[PDB]
């Protein structure tokens, strides 16, 4: 069957991840040859194609002379991987074709979901007819994380200058991997409105194209520096339940839209 898979677990915005397209080549006798075979994939506009990592015909790993790659940036983000005449010679009747390529998601954009589907288009050597087989659709979800720094007492007082790191964690008491780099940044500071937004993070409840198995996967914000005149909170680690359903909630805080999770973190004035 014609199948698409995505390997994206824990890959945030601007982290490389991969798609794989698998399809059966047609069958043909010794008196014929495969005259055309290509993969096509309309990449979501939020993706930046990086490179093809592998093209295989059965167990044969193809080389760059065996296929051509277009430039998705100049073809409306459509990727086309076409077997050359040398590449078509390496294809055996009924071979399982495979294409793996790498992308980066540039931003969350207007939906947490980012879908992908592909087509395999070839000439059937038995009839010389063009055949087009579409894959299933796979989905990758990312959301924005907005942090709003406030004074624990004085309601409505937002605080500039608070500094934070981000970690993977099982809980706020047990930090995992980090400080994480997200789109070249590994430390964020609250601005004049007491906020910053991390655009963006991989959701925890869905990964590699399917629902995640029940697990205690979370993100944690570590406040490393409090605003001037404020004591560093204890605890200074805030855990975030960064799921599709939690992100989708809206109008609970300023800037709380369906693609952003808003986390309000309190600080007590130095000397209480
Ligand atoms: Ca929201």
Numbering used by the authors: 184 to 455
Publication passage describing the model:
SpaD, the subject of this report, is the major pilin protein that forms the polymeric backbone, or shaft, of one of the three types of pilus expressed by the human pathogen C. diphtheriae. SpaD is an elongated molecule of ∼125 Å in length built from three tandem domains with Ig-type folds. As in some of the other Gram-positive major pilins, these three domains comprise a single CnaA-type domain flanked by two CnaB-type domains. Two crystal structures, of the full-length three-domain protein at 2.5 Å resolution and of a two-domain (D2-D3) construct at 1.87 Å resolution, show that each of the three Ig-like domains contains a single Lys–Asn isopeptide-bond cross-link, assumed to give mechanical stability as in other such pili.
We therefore sought to prepare a stable truncated fragment of SpaD that could be crystallized and used to solve the structure of the full-length protein by molecular replacement. This was achieved by partial trypsin digestion of the full-length selenomethionine-labelled form of SpaD (SeMet SpaD). This truncated form of SpaD (SeMet SpaDtryp) was crystallized in space group P212121 and its structure was solved by single-wavelength anomalous diffraction (SAD) methods from in-house data collected at a wavelength of 1.5418 Å, utilizing the signals from one Se atom, one Ca2+ ion and two S atoms (from a disulfide bond). The calcium ion was also used during phasing of SeMet SpaDtryp and gave rise to an anomalous signal consistent with that expected from calcium at an X-ray wavelength of 1.5418 Å. In contrast, domains D2 and D3 are almost linearly connected, with strands β17 and β18 running through the length of both domains. The D3 domain contains a calcium-binding site formed within a loop between strands β23 and β24.
